[PDB]
Amino acid sequence: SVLQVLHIPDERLRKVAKPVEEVNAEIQRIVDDMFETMYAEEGIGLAATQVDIHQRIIVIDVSENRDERLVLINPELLEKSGETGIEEGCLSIPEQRALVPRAEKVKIRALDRDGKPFELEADGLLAICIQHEMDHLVGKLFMDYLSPLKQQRIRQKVEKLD
Ligand SMILES: [Cl-]
Ligand SMILES: [Co+2]
């Protein structure tokens, strides 16, 4: 199904996701629903934290054709380098963008939708999106890198979209 994506200032968005236990049909059901939710909302990423499922699951698709599904279960950063930034958005912070510092390249380890371990070296938009979504799983938002005043203005803007 298309799931309910939480917005700030909801305190559940601040919870630390627990590691996935077993990659079984039930976790695969969450993966598949998260993709449907992500695509429905016009996104390039979605962390399980954002739909109120506090396990370490991320879905990504940065492709032009929208047919390149990346699944990261229990992801682990192995190395990063360089620095970069673009004006980032967030499905949990609707209509607000802001440039944030990021590593230019990352290397990660993860389990795929079958539970198979793999490694991935990323750069560009994919590297930035991987960093964005891993932040969610530890209860971190892109606004957290801006000044406290900017964080209060972003909140009141989104929060006056009833
Ligand atoms: Cl992003
Ligand atoms: Co986000």
From Swiss-Prot:
One of its GO terms (molecular function) is hydrolase activity. The keyword DNA repair does not apply. Upon overproduction is isolated with 1 Fe(2+) ion per monomer, a Ni(2+)-bound form is as active while a Zn(2+)-bound form is inactive. Gene3D superfamilies: Peptide deformylase. One of its GO terms (cellular component) is cytosol. The active site is at E133. Monomer. Belongs to the polypeptide deformylase family. This is Peptide deformylase. It comes from Escherichia coli (strain K12).
